[PDB]
Structure 1
């Protein structure tokens, strides 16, 4: 079998008895009545057993050596399943495969039983998960801090072509990976008021909610390092949430506890969109308040807080955990009694902020009346921070009164708001973008004034993905043939993939690379009929666009191309065209009307196209249901063409693009986010770039975007729009897509029409190349061999050195 580890005689035997120990003592079942779910748990407990020994010594190790600790705060950690990933990082995969085989079970069948830990929306949360893996693999004393939602991202269902949302009760049957830690439970305060006494302000009459931590192990890749991801759960105190007496009802008081505990109940399903709800703000303060107490308690052990920044680094994944800044000041000033200036120096030195987007609707601007009621003391601290900061600005730019209001953390107008992004820049010693072009846009546009004030704060850290889950785990076949030629060191040193460049003309390698992709497509095509049912052709080109549904991602632009292909076939039926299976998948936030309308359009197109006899098997339009991490692990390795077509300047970085490049797909996209660095790495000749560059978009905005012009000059485009308008795709409801057509024609913020012509022209070129298997595969080799820069191990090493001030190490911890 492959390089999924050794299947040692002693270890396969040991594994089997432990599997049986758990099936008996843990699941209290006997072979006779054991369900595949029982078997999955017996294995999970058996595999988990192998890392507790290492988990304990890693933590004990950091206590003894006492290195600088890295705290990654995020309201999202899109982890996915954890059984296989643990086997991989522990080199247990083959031994486990063999052992379950001897026990007469199919390991792959059991793996499918594990529920995804979908505590994330998309890119932002998956990054945090890839980062955790890399920090462990690079031997960093890092902790992931977040919220333990009992309901993660909703499960998407398609009814009559429409998306239906349903609760993701991922804890229903239990989580074998987490470990509750009821000794470090902590109190978090809300509401109350501020009393200004003689020796300081006091936050008084607050409502208390407890934060209970749950630890999940994060194993490094084959180095015996197991870090921790600590997730907080909300718990109501038993006293006041019952003890605030004088009528109301005892029963009611108890039932009302589910009011303080609602804080960790569900994840907000918004991707790149801000919703100013109180529950969201509560979650944000909750994770911040509890995490900081835990961070300081650990430090107090390790009171001059001058050394605090030398032992602590806290990274802010977006502005979601931005209250960490005024909260750190509160504790230092109100509780520890440090002077403002010393406190601020410490705060700025330990905090760092990462920006993930530039769209305005994604920006966090919290109404002042909300902060005023829920966190009175924090609002005071924010005003004081703002006051001193603006004084700095005035001193630097004398008389520049407009600059002052532009830079304020407080925004005036309808209702006063607090710009959380301005708060983060002011209280952090480093601010970074997630891709070179996004980082430049931050300096030139959005945060230009701040860059002029303190240029040294702004940096770039291009995103990356973990080659463990995103290669070895999901594509063992590709990982194996690569290993046959260059060894296994590349798994933790992706740059070595470049060595594959010298096999670009190797006849055996070209055949192998092409064979694994074929086996991957056949397996996906099978899975499709198995779990979703209705056939596809594995010989066609697999055209896939999978990511959250957004107007800026332009799934709509993809739709226009699909309809074009269809119309051309209907025009010249007996003309040869390269067969394609275009798959589009992704979730739409529940309140995002337009995004939900786009899902219906995709399914509507499929209804027409998939049942037209003249089309035959030359074109199928499929909507991939419930796109999530586990589903991504299946489609990506099977894709031929990766769609990354966002309007230039809107996708900060993207990471799915990197996943496809590493797995043998060719990319068709715009010069946006990381797409630029990828084409720069592979060579533009090995990439399918099209459309407007950032500057063309700006030129168009100066002159003014008029979709009618495009509609007027392109007959094919006009024909499509008139098809949608007349009900060609919605017979029973002819005006069903009027909102889409209306928007495309009059309020398209992302100029879909502007890139239409260059997009279908470019798609013609990919079809031309696909007709030449050998050359397509050779270009594929050029992409894979050149994807090494996009490993999160490179990203993390850069954060470590340029922001945290710590040195990565690939040293194996002293055995388990």
Structure 2
């Protein structure tokens, strides 16, 4: 078997008896009534047993050495399953495989029983998860802090071509990886009012909610380091949530506890979109308030807070945890009694902010009346922060009255609001973009005024992905052939993949790389019929676009191409075309009407195309249901063509693109986000770039975008639009897609037509190359061998050195 570790004689024996121990004592089952679910749990507990020893010494280590601690605050941690990832990082995979085999079980079958920890929406949440893995692997004293939602991202179901949402009860059968820590339970305050006394302000008459922490282990790759992800759960106190007497009902008071506990009930399913709901704000203050108390308690142990920034670094994943700035001030000033200026100095030096998008509708602008009611003291602090900041601006740009209102954290208008992004820049010593282009756009556009005031704050940290889960775990076959030639060191040193460049003309390697891709495609094609049922051709080109459904991601542009391919086949049926299986997957936020309309269009196209006999097996349109982390681990290694076609300037970075490049897929996309640095790394000749550049989009906006023009000059595009309008794709409901057509023609913010011609032309070139297996594979080797830069180990090493001020280390912790 592969390099999934050694199957030692002693360790396979030990594993088996512990598997049985747990099956008996933990699951209280006996082989004759054990269900596959019991077997999965016995294995999970047996594997978990192996890292508790290390988890304890790692945490004890940090206490003795007392290094600077990194706190990663995010309202999202898109973890996925954790059994395999743990076996991988512990080098237990083969041993476990062997042991379960001897017990007469199929490890892979058991792995599929684990539920995904879908506590994220998409890119932002998966980044945090990749980051955690890298911070552990780089030996950093880091903690991931978040919310333990009992309901993660909803499970997607397609009914009659429409998306149906359903509760993700991932904790239903229990979570063997987490461990409640009811000793560090903390109180969080809401509402109340502010009393201004003789020696300071006081936050009074507040409603209390308890925050109970649950720790989940985060093992580093083969270095015996296990860090911690602490997730908070909301709990109602037993007193006031019953003790506030004078009629109401005792039963009612108890049932009403599910009101304070609703704070950690569900994740908001919005990807790159802001919904100003009170419940959201409560979740945001909740994770911040609890986390800070825990951070300060740890520090008090390790009261001059001058050294606080020297021992603490808190990273803000977007503006979601932005209340950490005025909350740190509140504690330091109101509770610790530090003077404002000393408190502010400490706050700025420990906080750092990460921006993830430039679209306006994703920007967090909280109505003042909301903050005023829920967090009265924080609003006072934000006004004071704003006051002192604007004074800094006025002093720097005398008379620039327009700049003053532009930079204010407080936005005037219909209803006053607080611009959380402005708050973050002001109270952080570093603000970074997630890709070189996005970072530049921040300085030139969105945060130009802030950049002019404090240029030193703005940085860039291109995103990355973990090679462990995103290669070794999901593509062992590819990882193995690579290791056969260059060794195993690249797993934690992805740059070494360049060495593969010298095998680009190797006849054996070219044959292998192509073989694993073929095996991956056959396995996925099988999985497709197994769990979803309705055949696909594994000899075709696997054209896949998987990511959340958005207008800026242009799944619609992908659709126009698919209809074009179909129309050309119908025109010249007996003409040869490279067979394609185009797979589009992703979830739409429940309230996003357009995004839900697009899913219906995709399935509608498949209904026509997949049953047309003239088309045969040359073209299949498949919608990948319930796209999530575990599903991504299956499609990506099987993809040939990765679709990264967002309008230039809208996708901050993207990370799925990097996942595909590492797994042997060629990329067709625009010069957007990280796509630019990928092409720049692999060479533009090894990339399928097309469409407008940022500059072209701006030029078009200056003159004005008119979709009619494109409709008028391109007969193929016109034909498609008239097909949708006449009900060609929706016979029973001819006007079903009027909203899409109407939008495309009159309010397309992402100029889909503007990139249509260059897109189908470019698609022609990829089909041409696919016709030449040898050259296609050689170009694939050029992408893989050049993907090393996109490992989160590189991203983290940069955050560590340029923002946190800590030195990464690949030193093995002193055994378990």
* TM-score, normalization by structure 2: 1.00
Q: 1:720, 1:351 → 2: CA distance?
A: 51
Distance 1:341 1:26 in 2: 55
Unaligned runs of at least 5 residues, structure 2? none
Q: Describe the SS at the equivalent of 1:813.
A: coil
Distance in 1 between residues matched to 2:263 and 2:109, nearest whole Å: 36
Cα distance between partner residues in 2 of 1:610 and 1:111: 32
How far apart are 1:703 and its partner, in Å? Answer: 0.1
Shift of 1:509: 0.0
1:65 Cα offset (Å): 0.0
CA distance in 2, matches of 1:598, 1:198: 61
- 1:183-236 Cα distance to aligned partner (Å, 9 max, x none): 000000000000000000000000000000000000000000000000000000
2:392 aligned counterpart, secondary structure: helix
- Structure 1: how far apart are the matches of 2:745 and 2:778? 41
CA distance, structure 1, for counterparts of residue 151 and residue 16 of structure 2: 34
TM-aligned CA deviation for residue 470 of structure 1 = 0.1
Shift of 1:717: 0.0
Q: Secondary structure at the residue paired with 2:696?
A: helix
1:741 aligns to what SS in structure 2?
helix
Q: Secondary structure at the match of 1:588?
A: coil
Query: By how many angstroms is 1:691 displaced?
Result: 0.0
Q: For 2:545 and 2:184, how far apart are their aligned partners in 1?
A: 44
Cα deviation per residue 1:757-803 (whole Å; 9 max; x = unaligned)?
00000000000000000000000000000000000000000000000
Report the 3-state secondary structure (helix = DSSP H, G, I; strand = E; otherwise coil) of the residue aligned with 1:183.
coil
Cα deviations by residue, 1:510-559 (Å, 9 ceiling, x for unpaired): 00000000000000000000000000000000000000000000000000
Q: CA deviation at 1:745?
A: 0.0
Deviation of the 1:68 alpha carbon? 0.1
Residue 637 of structure 1 and its aligned partner are, at CA, apart by 0.0
SS at match of 1:34: coil
- Describe the superposition over 1:228-257 as per-residue Cα deviations: whole angstroms up to 9, x where unpaired: 000000000000000000000000000000
Task: Write the deviation string for residues 458-504 of structure 1: whole angstroms up to 9, x where unpaired.
Answer: 00000000000000000000000000000000000000000000000
Counterpart Cα distance in 2 of 1:444 and 1:16: 60
Secondary structure, in 3 states, of the residue corresponding to 2:227? strand
Give the whole-Å Cα distance in 2 for the aligned partners of 1:385 and 1:698: 35
Partners in 2 of 1:384 and 1:770 — Cα distance?
61
Distance between the aligned counterparts of 2:543 and 2:806, measured in 1?
A: 42
**Structure 2 Cα separation of the partners of residues 248 and 259 of structure 1:** 16
- Secondary structure class of the residue paired with 1:652: coil
Superposed displacement of residue 108, structure 1: 0.0
Q: CA deviation at 1:607?
A: 0.0
Q: Hey, what does 1:622 align to over in structure 2? A: 622
Q: 1:780, 1:790 → 2: CA distance?
A: 16
* Aligned-partner SS, 2:543: strand
Secondary structure at the residue paired with 1:124?
A: helix
How far apart are residue 673 of structure 1 and its match? 0.0
Q: Distance in 2 between matches of 1:413 and 1:481?
A: 61
Offset of residue 754 of structure 1: 0.1
Looking at structure 1, the residues matched to 239 and 788 of structure 2 have their Cα atoms a distance apart, in angstroms, of: 56
Q: Distance in 1 between matches of 2:286 and 2:732?
A: 49
What is the rounded CA distance, in whole Å, between the counterparts of 2:259 and 2:700 in structure 1? 50
d(CA) in 1 for partners of 2:57 and 2:323?
33
For 1:202 and 1:655, the matched residues in 2 are separated by: 45
1:724-759: CA deviation from partner (whole Å, max 9, x where unpaired): 000000000000000000000000000000000000
Distance 1:665 1:362 in 2: 30
SS in 2 for 1:292: helix
CA distance in 2, matches of 1:540, 1:506: 25
For residues 247-282 of structure 1, the C-alpha deviation after alignment (integer angstroms, 9 at most, x for no partner) is: 000000000000000000000000000000000000
- CA RMSD in angstroms, aligned pairs only: 0.1
CA distance in 1, matches of 2:199, 2:182: 34
Cα deviation for residue 317 of structure 1 reads: 0.1
Summarize deviations over 1:94-141 as a string: whole Å, max 9, x none: 000000000000000000000000000000000000000000000000
Cα displacement (A) at 1:320? 0.0
The Cα offsets for residues 138-180 of structure 1, whole Å up to 9 and x where unpaired, read as 0000000000000000000000000000000000000000000
SS in 2 for 1:728: coil
Separation in 2 of the partners of 1:88 and 1:387?
52
**Alpha-carbon separation, structure 2, partners of 1:779 and 1:504:** 8
Partner-residue secondary structure (3-state), 1:157? strand
Q: Distance in 2 between matches of 1:431 and 1:533?
A: 48
Please give the alpha-carbon distance, in whole angstroms, between the structure 1 residues aligned to 2:20 and 2:292: 42
Tell me how far apart the structure 1 counterparts of residues 147 and 313 of structure 2 sit (CA, whole Å): 19
Distance 1:430 1:402 in 2: 25
Helix, strand or coil: the match of 1:623?
strand
Partners of 1:745 and 1:327 lie apart in 2 by 47
SS, match of residue 19 in structure 1: helix
SS of the equivalent of 2:649 reads coil
CA distance in 2, matches of 1:479, 1:598: 36
The whole-number CA distance in structure 1 between the counterparts of 2:32 and 2:507 is: 52
Cα distance in structure 1, aligned partners of 2:410 and 2:27: 56
1:642 is paired with a residue of what secondary structure?
A: strand
1:585 aligns with 2:585: yes
Shift of 1:60: 0.0
Deviation for aligned residue 1:15: 0.0
Q: After superposition, what is the alpha-carbon deviation per residue over 1:398-420, rounded to whole angstroms, capped at 9, x for unaligned?
A: 00000000000000000000000
**For residues 258-317 of structure 1, what are the alpha-carbon distances to aligned partners after superposition, in whole Å with 9 as ceiling and x for unaligned?**
000000000000000000000000000000000000000000000000000000000000
CA distance in 2 between counterparts of 1:188 and 1:179 reads 21
1:578 CA displacement: 0.0
**SS state of the match for residue 744, structure 2?**
helix
Q: Provide the secondary structure at the position in 2 that maps to 1:39.
A: helix
State the Cα distance separating 1:85 from its structure 2 match.
0.1
Aligned length: 816
1:700-732 alpha-carbon deviations (Å, 9 max, x no partner): 000000000000000000000000000000000
Question: Displacement of 1:35 after TM fit?
Answer: 0.1
CA distance in 2: counterparts of 1:559 and 1:541, whole angstroms: 16
| SS in structure 1 at match of 2:497 | helix
2:415 match: 415
Match of 2:300 in 1: 300
How far 1:12 sits from its partner (Å)?
0.0
Q: How far did 1:351 drift?
A: 0.1
Q: Structure 1, residues 355-404: CA drift from partner, whole Å, max 9, x if none? A: 00000000000000000000000000000000000000000000000000
Instruction: Provide TM-score, normalisation by structure 1.
Output: 1.00
Shift of 1:680: 0.1
Which secondary structure state, in structure 1, belongs to the residue aligned with residue 542 of structure 2?
Answer: strand
CA distance in 1, matches of 2:656, 2:634: 13
Asked if 1:788 is matched to 2:803, the reply is no
- TM-superposition CA deviations, 1:650-709 (whole Å, max 9, x none): 000000000000000000000000000000000000000000000000000000000000
How far 1:567 sits from its partner (Å)? 0.0
1 CA distance for matches of 2:649 and 2:200? 47
Task: Name stretches of at least 5 consecutive residues in structure 1 with no aligned partner.
Answer: none
Matches within 5 A, 1:371-382: 371-382=371-382
